[PDB]
Design an enzyme around this catalytic site. Sequence first.
Site, PDB file in Angstrom:
ATOM      1  N   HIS B  42       0.361  10.228  -7.469  1.00 26.34           N
ATOM      2  CA  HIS B  42      -0.566  10.281  -6.346  1.00 26.34           C
ATOM      3  C   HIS B  42      -2.032  10.356  -6.777  1.00 26.34           C
ATOM      4  O   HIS B  42      -2.932   9.983  -6.013  1.00 26.34           O
ATOM      5  CB  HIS B  42      -0.204  11.402  -5.353  1.00 26.34           C
ATOM      6  CG  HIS B  42      -0.882  12.723  -5.597  1.00 26.34           C
ATOM      7  ND1 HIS B  42      -0.201  13.841  -6.031  1.00 26.34           N
ATOM      8  CD2 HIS B  42      -2.153  13.131  -5.366  1.00 26.34           C
ATOM      9  CE1 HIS B  42      -1.032  14.873  -6.085  1.00 26.34           C
ATOM     10  NE2 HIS B  42      -2.230  14.462  -5.711  1.00 26.34           N
ATOM     11  N   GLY B 186      -1.573  16.925 -10.777  1.00 26.20           N
ATOM     12  CA  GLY B 186      -1.308  16.116 -12.002  1.00 26.20           C
ATOM     13  C   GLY B 186      -1.240  16.966 -13.289  1.00 26.20           C
ATOM     14  O   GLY B 186      -0.771  16.491 -14.349  1.00 26.20           O
TER      15      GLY B 186
END
Lengths: 52, 234
Positions: B42, B186
């Site tokens: 994402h 992340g």
Amino acid sequence: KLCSLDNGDCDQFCHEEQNSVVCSCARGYTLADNGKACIPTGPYPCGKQTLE
Amino acid sequence: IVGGQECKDGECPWQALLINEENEGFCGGTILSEFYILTAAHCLYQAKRFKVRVGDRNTEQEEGGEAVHEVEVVIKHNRFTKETYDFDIAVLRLKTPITFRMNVAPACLPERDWAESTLMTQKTGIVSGFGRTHEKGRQSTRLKMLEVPYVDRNSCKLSSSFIITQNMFCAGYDTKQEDACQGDSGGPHVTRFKDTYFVTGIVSWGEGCARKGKYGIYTKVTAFLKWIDRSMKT
Ligand SMILES: C[C@@H](C(=O)N1CCOCC1)N1CC[C@H](NS(=O)(=O)c2ccc(-c3ccc(Cl)s3)s2)C1=O
Ligand SMILES: [Ca+2]
């Protein structure tokens, strides 16, 4: 029993074979003569906080 | 990171920061080896062009260990989907290799079965990043870390207003004011075992940050070990 009892005395990965503990290590380590401990092959091995 | 503490010298050496054209961090990553960074799929939409910075703990001073690296190849999981954030995982190949040193080293990739029975059954994991210090606050100029308890899978599904797939897990606190947050996405979720730190998750999403009755949602790395291995060869 085996790997469920204190990780089978292994420093890292523990696997059960033929009712017996087998130890192994992450990439960049080698299994010691005792078949349990993991020794870094070189500088800056994975998973260790740095000191120099 | 909401709460927790500063990463002290040498304590979070596998931390990477994805930086935009303005040299501003928008997501984190985990150093896996001299050429590869683990991140969330994402994150690959929050900037047209980006670079990866490593060896940094204070974004306002030059400590001497910092290094910026260009990305050669972006490897996104093909089954990724924005509807649910399922399969939220990507691997980055760098143009030049990372030179390990103080504050710059990789986290270990574990084996699947051992990680699931032995790492993910530990009391806690550690999350880290330069993200927001509270839900409506600014990003941190200091790298932070926080111990987060593993959360029972049933309790997590009950608490959530969004689907928790088999490729996700929950960690954090019911009411205590400590969580990951925006900007940490992340980044690393690692688990310590006999003084060695293994990658166990990737910071993915949450309903805000540190809200009551809500937990942090992480990509389940152990479900992606063969995929990661493949990506780091091709
Ligand atoms: C529920 C989720 C969302 O919009 N989804 C998730 C499921 O897929 C569709 C969209 N959501 C609501 C708003 C929130 N965005 S945010 O506040 O910028 C945010 C980013 C990352 C956050 C994290 C908190 C704890 C962990 Cl771990 S990371 S908090 C966020 O990620
Ligand atoms: Ca700095």
